[PDB]
Write a protein that binds this ligand. Sequence first.
Ligand SMILES: O=c1ccn([C@@H]2O[C@H](COP(=O)(O)OP(=O)(O)OP(=O)(O)O)[C@@H](O)[C@H]2O)c(=O)[nH]1
Ligand SMILES: [Mg+2]
Length: 382
Amino acid sequence: VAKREFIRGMMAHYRASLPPPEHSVVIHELQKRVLDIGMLAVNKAHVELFGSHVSGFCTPHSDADISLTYRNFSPWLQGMERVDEQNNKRMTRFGKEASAMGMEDVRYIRARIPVVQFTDGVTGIHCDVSIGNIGGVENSKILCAIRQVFPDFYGAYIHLVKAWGKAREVIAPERSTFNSFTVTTMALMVLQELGLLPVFSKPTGEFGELTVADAEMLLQEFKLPPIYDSLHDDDEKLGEAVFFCLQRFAEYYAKYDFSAGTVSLIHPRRHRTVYERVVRRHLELLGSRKRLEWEKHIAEHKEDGPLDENDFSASMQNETTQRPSNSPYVVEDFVNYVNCGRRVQASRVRHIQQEFNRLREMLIDKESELKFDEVFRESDTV
Ligand SMILES: O=c1ccn([C@@H]2O[C@H](COP(=O)(O)OP(=O)(O)OP(=O)(O)O)[C@@H](O)[C@H]2O)c(=O)[nH]1
Ligand SMILES: [Mg+2]
């Protein structure tokens, strides 16, 4: 009876978090507004959505992630001081034109990603605008593709993992733990090990990353178990399947050896030191491409030269720093081998790692004792 009510409520909650019918249009108009601001700021403004609004793993409270690009934008020129400063000047104007258009709480943040955040003056949606977030654009298209296999199954599962994580401070970026995307990736890996998602074992990007095309290819061949086809018109049955995966998810990350293995949708459980060599190869490829592009920019803007090896070295150092193999968690972004879980400090390894021991205790051991509003609520701890 407790289990049956828990599953009922949990699906209820998922069903109440699905974007309303008109929401597609809202988000499209939002994009149009951002592009208007962008056009005032940069030449050949281009605005591209990513994040959960692209993947579809969103609530009506989820923010809007937008990648801004412009004429002669190049991802490889990041690190070069003159291009960096040029981008800062682009984001400065973006900020100023955003306030003028009537965006609220406009904030230009100078960071590991020069970013402009604002609250849309029309719909109240929070917006995170960054220059050339190519990795975000791509891995959001891969996630959307995954969700499409059976939206309510993956959606519900990912929703509840996210609701759980958010509500439980497992996903608390500005609070030193994981972000939505890291947690999504973890939850998706557990489905791979259950045979409920395919293993993206053969990436074919220029730098060895997984591409949208790699992902779509596999997801077209992947079939869920036959029993899954009775779950489309029965929320009690589907909820049972989702609940099963949540138990397996809670379980997995309560017992998973991160001291050896990594989380990866490309190579589940790949050893840290193998990831290390994978990163080294990736960055050797990224590094040389980068060098070629800096050298081309420099040939065309001689006063921006000569190629300053300190600058290059520090740029490469930032790429290396995005990808430690030797950190509390190694959760691999499949599009760039970024260790999107690198930010979780050794001291947090406790919180998370208990609250997983705790999710699985409620879902499995104390199954007969289940209450929706006790598993999924605020946890002021970190
Ligand atoms: O470490 C990261 C963080 C973020 N990202 C990329 O930026 C996107 C937006 O970052 P968000 O924090 O908004 O996550 P999200 O959109 O998946 O989920 P909610 O907002 O609904 O909670 C992520 O979905 C991913 O595309 C990364 O690639 N790596
Ligand atoms: Mg988002």
